[PDB]
Amino acid sequence: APVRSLNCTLRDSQQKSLVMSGPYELKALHLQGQDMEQQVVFSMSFVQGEESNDKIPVALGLKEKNLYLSCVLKDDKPTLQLESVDPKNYPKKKMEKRFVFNKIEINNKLEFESAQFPNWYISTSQAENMPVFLGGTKGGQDITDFTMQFVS
């Protein structure tokens, strides 16, 4: 049947919000009140891939945009990018591996591991207005835990 998707926002464990701030750019910053309209709304699709109770393969598209988070090698490093797709063909259940994240529930938080690059995670910095990047450890100064808010 059709791929199933939910609208949602994400916040890092320091309660920073994600924003489209530049052509293909996601950054994280502290937001509250009127400025919260600026946050990115995701369409989280539940896609094909290896699955367990606490590890669920998803794709993260921007709501009603043909843009997806994806993991590719750039200048020889696993990186996080926003990638445009053919809007006639997306979302789909069999998303290509660069678009797949394992959504992992640990201690009431979520982590998003790259399916393509094991043990590389969607991450945010301590500091305000830095890239949303792919980080090669769920351990240190960088933030790899999030909460999800469900949106209408």
Residues 24 and 81: beta-carbon distance below 8 Å: yes
Residue closer to ligand A7N by CB (options 43, 88) is: 43
Least distance (Å) from ligand A7N to the CB of residue 82?
5
Nearer to ligand A7N, 50 or 75 (CB): 75
Cα–Cα distances in angstroms (integers) from residue 149 to residues 38, 57, 128, in the given order: 15, 18, 21
Cα-Cα-Cα-Cα torsion 117, 120, 125, 131, nearest 10 degrees, comes to 0
Distance CA 73, CA 54 (A): 27
Q: In angstroms, give the least distance from the CB of 80 to ligand A7N.
A: 5
In this structure, what DSSP letter does residue 42 have?
E
Positions that interact with ligand A7N (CB under 6 A) = 25-26, 80-82, 131-132
- What does the alpha-carbon distance between residue 68 and residue 47 come to, in Å, rounded to a whole number? 13
Query: At its nearest, how many Å lie between ligand A7N and the CB of residue 24?
Result: 6
The residue (of 45 and 123) whose beta carbon lies closer to ligand A7N is 123
- Residue (of 114, 136, 105) closest to 60 by Cα position: 114
- Residue 54 or residue 128: which is nearer to ligand A7N going by CB? 128
Residue 27 CB, nearest approach to ligand A7N (Å): 6
